[PDB]
Amino acid sequence: YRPLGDKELWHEAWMYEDKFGTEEDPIIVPSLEAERIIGVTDPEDETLVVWGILKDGEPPRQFVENGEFYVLKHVEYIKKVGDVLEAIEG
Amino acid sequence: GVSSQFFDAPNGPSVKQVLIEDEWYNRQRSIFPLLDKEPYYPVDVFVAPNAVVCGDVDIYGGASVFFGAVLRGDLNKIRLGNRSAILDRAVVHAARAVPTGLNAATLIGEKVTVEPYAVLRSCRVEPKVIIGARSVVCEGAVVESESILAPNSVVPPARRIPSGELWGGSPAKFIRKLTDHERDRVLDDVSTHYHNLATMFRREALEPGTAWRDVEAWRQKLVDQGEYEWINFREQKYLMRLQHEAEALEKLT
Amino acid sequence: NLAFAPVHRKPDVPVNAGQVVPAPPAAARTLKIKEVVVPNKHSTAFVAANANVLGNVKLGAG
Amino acid sequence: KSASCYAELSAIHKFEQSKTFEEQYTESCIIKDRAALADPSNSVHQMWEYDSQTALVARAKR
Amino acid sequence: GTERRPGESGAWKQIERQRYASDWENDPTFKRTPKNLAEVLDDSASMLLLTDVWRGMAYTLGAFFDKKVTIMYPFEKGQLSPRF
Amino acid sequence: XXXXXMIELDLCFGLLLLILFGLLSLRNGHVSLAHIRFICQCWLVMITPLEVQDFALCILTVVLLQSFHSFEALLFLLLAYIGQLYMMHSCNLVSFYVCLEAQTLCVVVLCGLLARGASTSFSVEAALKFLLLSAMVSGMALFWFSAMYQRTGSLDMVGQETFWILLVMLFKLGVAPMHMWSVDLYGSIPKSLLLYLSTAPKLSLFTFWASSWHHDFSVGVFILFSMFIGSIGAYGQPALRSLFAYSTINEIGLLLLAVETAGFHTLYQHLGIYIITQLLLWNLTDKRLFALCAVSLAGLPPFAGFFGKAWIFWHAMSVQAFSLLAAALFCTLLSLVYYLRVIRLFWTAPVHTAASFTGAPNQTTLTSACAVALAFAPVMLVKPFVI
């Protein structure tokens, strides 16, 4: 997990994960539904945004070139990071 | 076997120490003191950013230290004369003692030029002398003024170099007599040439530069994350000194 | 900070002085670097900040 | 003797080199204040006694 | 009383210490700080206007009007015992 | 009504506030007092009247305050400047004596305090010598002042007794043969205090002379003493300090010569030029400009010293003072020898300047380079300017 200082406590991290999603180890996106829109910036340009749609039960998918891979996972609760796991401070 | 810590430093002991393998960007200083031995350089000195200078080193006049050169005056005092040329990646060193019995300090006279890749250690270099590349003068040897040393020449310890002559070889030997014009101007010619180059480099000195911005940005990010740490070096040093005094006094009786 | 810089883990080259270490995840995900070999340096040893030490190097204690 | 003396030199150079930037700036400021205290006629010297290593008042003189 | 005060210490190390460190406050044997106008006036009456000399003065003055134990030798002698 | 005397009350209030402020600043463990220095400069600005001489002395002192760092010495300099400024306003010998003695005591104290190193002992000895001779001169002045007070029964500075007032005025400028105290002071005291001495009391005394002094005598023989002795000594003394001391003696002799023939405009301009040069002198860090001071003192044409001596010679000829004019010419010639010697000593030499280590990197570049711009002055100077 990235440093949670200057992060709002309700931003639901997984976005603040310390990992670069690869093909053999994607970043698992939690979702309350079978599909969800996420936004990924260009690794070579912070100003460029590509919005994509991940679907439940799919292979790893890359949105921008030379970007992270992603896999959606349907969950019933998303850890609202800032008082869920840093109050745990495990 | 000496601890890397100094409680009796002229400035106090360092509280937090950082591992070199933990360094993510180089922090190499060109000039820095050695305990209570401090540098002495002219206001218009040319020091290449990749040069190495430390401690009790004397430099006079329009002398120059060029890229990657080393002047490590840790074991003795080092003196550099007026308008003396030190080219790239040369070393001026010294020892604690010499068989000759004189001062082990390495002396360089004024208007003395040094080609790249030279090792100077505990030698007296009279003014107006040329030093060749891949050439070394050992401890206790003396080079008289108005002399030219060929490159790839070895000067053994405690040897003498008579003036007005050209010498060279491994070991060094007589070659030919320097002409009167060579004594008159040529040495000073090389001195002025390399001093002009050094001042040319000094003209475009953008010091201290702007590369600190990125490091400042990273520190500012740590501040936003709050992980950047505050430490009073003064009071922590006072506590460390008191701890040293207490622990030392608690072990005599 | 190139005093401690990696080199390429090659198949034929026997690593006996340095030590293989995993590459940072960015290097692997970007330009296919899985194993890198960094010097095995004793903590008591000292290296200047301007040297060029890379890869399969062992430094003795002190 | 070379082994021993250069081991000592390596230790001293590691000590000098392993210092943080903020600590070096602190040292520079301490040197500045010490030179400011090199004046025998400094007004503070009949009231405040400073530490040599830290340029901070340890006790009053009178 | 047996209480102590800042400035009433007869030394330099202790005086310099108390005027530059509050260590005496942690000591319970030092009289605690006044907290109101009444206590400040009490402290002023303690320091100024004496009020400490006055008691011993009065006791000595009462001793002036008091009896004595003086004997008129050789016309008077002391008390002794047979074991003398 | 006291409504017309507000500024003196302001001086007193500001001194009291400065005392309390300096006391409070010292309890904090502060080690530098540049804030105190700027506050003192501001207070000097406010207490200054609107006279050209007053402002000149004020600004001269204002620049000089950058060269000191101890609160007490700042206070002493402030009080000495007060005495000087009020000496420019002294209409009677009582205030004149008080101002002279206050300035003398301040000078003695300042010389005594700021010593450091092994030089301290010689500074103390020179300061005590100056104190003793100042005390005897002050007693002489008081004696003759009392005699005049008896004869006239008034506060007029007239009569035969004024000759000794003239003598006492001479003693304060180091008028040879009452010059040797200046030489002794040049011998040991650090450069900042000597920098002060060469400018301020001389300026104030010349102004007070110009405003409220007349006498029925001459000073020409003393002018001869000063000129000849200073020239010969500055030629013969290998020590740089004594060299500049005897140079100052010769210059004050030149100023006295200008005085004797009236025409105080040239006196004023030459005093200003010499004070500029002295300001440039004692704050030097590079030695290349050091010869410029000599050429501005040796009367070499293109710079201001030459013209400053030149109008003086013009006014001396305006009264056909042939004797002292010829003497001044010969002494000007004799100056050139040791001035060229100075040039050789600090021009035909390898260039070297030490770098600062405790910060304060060449802390006096600005005033130095500003005083250097004197070659541009003669443009405005050649016209009838100072008059």
Side-chain angles (χ1 to χ4, degrees), chain F residues 119 199 247 271 281 286 341:
Chain F
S119 69
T199 62
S247 79
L271 178 54
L281 167 64
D286 192 307
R341 161 158 85 230

PDB file of all heavy atoms in Angstrom, chain F residues 119 199 247 271 281 286 341:
ATOM      1  N   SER F 119      47.862  41.282  19.420  1.00  0.00           N
ATOM      2  CA  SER F 119      47.900  42.716  19.164  1.00  0.00           C
ATOM      3  C   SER F 119      47.245  43.524  20.274  1.00  0.00           C
ATOM      4  O   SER F 119      47.397  44.750  20.307  1.00  0.00           O
ATOM      5  CB  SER F 119      47.218  43.023  17.832  1.00  0.00           C
ATOM      6  OG  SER F 119      45.821  42.804  17.918  1.00  0.00           O
ATOM      7  N   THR F 199      37.927  60.020   9.133  1.00  0.00           N
ATOM      8  CA  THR F 199      36.841  60.689   8.426  1.00  0.00           C
ATOM      9  C   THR F 199      36.007  61.592   9.323  1.00  0.00           C
ATOM     10  O   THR F 199      35.875  62.785   9.039  1.00  0.00           O
ATOM     11  CB  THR F 199      35.951  59.634   7.765  1.00  0.00           C
ATOM     12  OG1 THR F 199      35.386  58.792   8.779  1.00  0.00           O
ATOM     13  CG2 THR F 199      36.769  58.778   6.816  1.00  0.00           C
ATOM     14  N   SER F 247      51.133  59.648   5.379  1.00  0.00           N
ATOM     15  CA  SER F 247      50.333  60.165   4.273  1.00  0.00           C
ATOM     16  C   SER F 247      49.174  61.009   4.793  1.00  0.00           C
ATOM     17  O   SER F 247      48.893  62.091   4.266  1.00  0.00           O
ATOM     18  CB  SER F 247      49.820  59.011   3.414  1.00  0.00           C
ATOM     19  OG  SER F 247      48.703  58.388   4.021  1.00  0.00           O
ATOM     20  N   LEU F 271      38.398  67.103   1.224  1.00  0.00           N
ATOM     21  CA  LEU F 271      38.046  66.275   2.371  1.00  0.00           C
ATOM     22  C   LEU F 271      37.115  65.144   1.956  1.00  0.00           C
ATOM     23  O   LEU F 271      37.281  63.998   2.388  1.00  0.00           O
ATOM     24  CB  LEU F 271      37.405  67.133   3.459  1.00  0.00           C
ATOM     25  CG  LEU F 271      36.933  66.387   4.706  1.00  0.00           C
ATOM     26  CD1 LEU F 271      38.069  65.564   5.286  1.00  0.00           C
ATOM     27  CD2 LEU F 271      36.403  67.366   5.737  1.00  0.00           C
ATOM     28  N   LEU F 281      39.775  52.303   1.342  1.00  0.00           N
ATOM     29  CA  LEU F 281      41.026  51.705   1.795  1.00  0.00           C
ATOM     30  C   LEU F 281      40.784  50.552   2.762  1.00  0.00           C
ATOM     31  O   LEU F 281      41.179  49.410   2.502  1.00  0.00           O
ATOM     32  CB  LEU F 281      41.901  52.778   2.446  1.00  0.00           C
ATOM     33  CG  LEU F 281      43.111  52.287   3.242  1.00  0.00           C
ATOM     34  CD1 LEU F 281      44.100  51.573   2.333  1.00  0.00           C
ATOM     35  CD2 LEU F 281      43.780  53.451   3.949  1.00  0.00           C
ATOM     36  N   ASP F 286      40.358  42.613  -2.293  1.00  0.00           N
ATOM     37  CA  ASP F 286      41.271  42.404  -3.405  1.00  0.00           C
ATOM     38  C   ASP F 286      42.355  43.473  -3.386  1.00  0.00           C
ATOM     39  O   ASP F 286      42.102  44.632  -3.040  1.00  0.00           O
ATOM     40  CB  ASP F 286      40.519  42.437  -4.734  1.00  0.00           C
ATOM     41  CG  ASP F 286      41.361  41.945  -5.900  1.00  0.00           C
ATOM     42  OD1 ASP F 286      42.484  42.460  -6.095  1.00  0.00           O
ATOM     43  OD2 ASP F 286      40.899  41.039  -6.621  1.00  0.00           O
ATOM     44  N   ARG F 341      55.976  52.965  -4.847  1.00  0.00           N
ATOM     45  CA  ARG F 341      56.382  51.799  -4.068  1.00  0.00           C
ATOM     46  C   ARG F 341      55.175  50.939  -3.704  1.00  0.00           C
ATOM     47  O   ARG F 341      55.212  49.710  -3.819  1.00  0.00           O
ATOM     48  CB  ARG F 341      57.121  52.268  -2.818  1.00  0.00           C
ATOM     49  CG  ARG F 341      57.216  51.249  -1.710  1.00  0.00           C
ATOM     50  CD  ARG F 341      58.369  51.600  -0.796  1.00  0.00           C
ATOM     51  NE  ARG F 341      57.991  52.566   0.230  1.00  0.00           N
ATOM     52  CZ  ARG F 341      58.671  53.672   0.501  1.00  0.00           C
ATOM     53  NH1 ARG F 341      59.760  53.997  -0.173  1.00  0.00           N
ATOM     54  NH2 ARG F 341      58.251  54.469   1.479  1.00  0.00           N
TER      55      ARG F 341
END
